[PDB]
Amino acid sequence: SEEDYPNGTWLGDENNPEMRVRCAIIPSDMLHISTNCRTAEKMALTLLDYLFHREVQAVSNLSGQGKHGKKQLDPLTIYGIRCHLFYKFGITESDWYRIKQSIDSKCRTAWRRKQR
DNA sequence: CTCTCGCGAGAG
DNA sequence: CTCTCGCGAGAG
């Protein structure tokens, strides 16, 4: 619902209420991202940085499972990335499976940075 | 920085 | 048991 982020933007197709998610990204920032992120792979990781602070990435993963006892990244927010990539690039479930590896791998990089 | 792959420990 | 999947870290 728009109200959760009054100065924010929609992830995915605003005219399609089942595949939209209100988010905290401001219009000027969402403009930068669409200008700069010309592939689903590059938009996914840039969305990640605008939706989650690096300090959340360094403690969090997609499942919230594993040996490091990591927090799970907000599932509604992750669904919102899925909705933006499907809308912006018409990616498939097989692409999204690949993208999710890459989000988790970025999150491990951040954990390893805090580590080192 | 991103992308990837072999590993092996718990989930099923 | 088999299967999934979180993981470290070398290579791009």
Structure-determination approach: X-ray
Query: What residues contact A29, with CB distance under 8 A and at least 6 apart?
Result: A9, A50
* Beta bridge partners of residue A71, listed in sequence order: A60
Annotated resolution, angstroms: 2.1
Distance of C1' in C4 from CA in A62, Å: 14
Phi, psi of A114, deg, nearest 5: -55, -45
Q: Looking only at Cα atoms, what is the longest distance across chain A?
A: 45
Contact A84, A95 (CB under 8 A): no
d(CA A35, CA A79): 22
The CATH number assigned to the domain holding A98 equals 1.10.10.2590
d(CA A79, CA A75): 6
Contact A76, A1 (CB under 8 A): no
| Tally of domains within chain A | 1
Q: Which residue has the tokens 């009054």?
A: A6
The three-state secondary structure class of A72 is: strand
Q: Which nucleotide is nearest to A103 (CA to C1')?
A: B2
Query: If you compute the radius of gyration of chain A from its CA atoms, what whole number of angstroms results?
Result: 14
Alpha-helical runs (H) found in A1-116:
27-36, 40-51, 54-57, 75-89, 93-115
Q: Which nucleotides of B are covered by protein (CB under 7 A)?
A: 1-5, 9-11
d(CA A43, CA A108): 18
The three-state secondary structure class of A2 is: helix
For residue A26, give its domain range: 2-115
Contact A85, A44 (CB under 8 A): yes
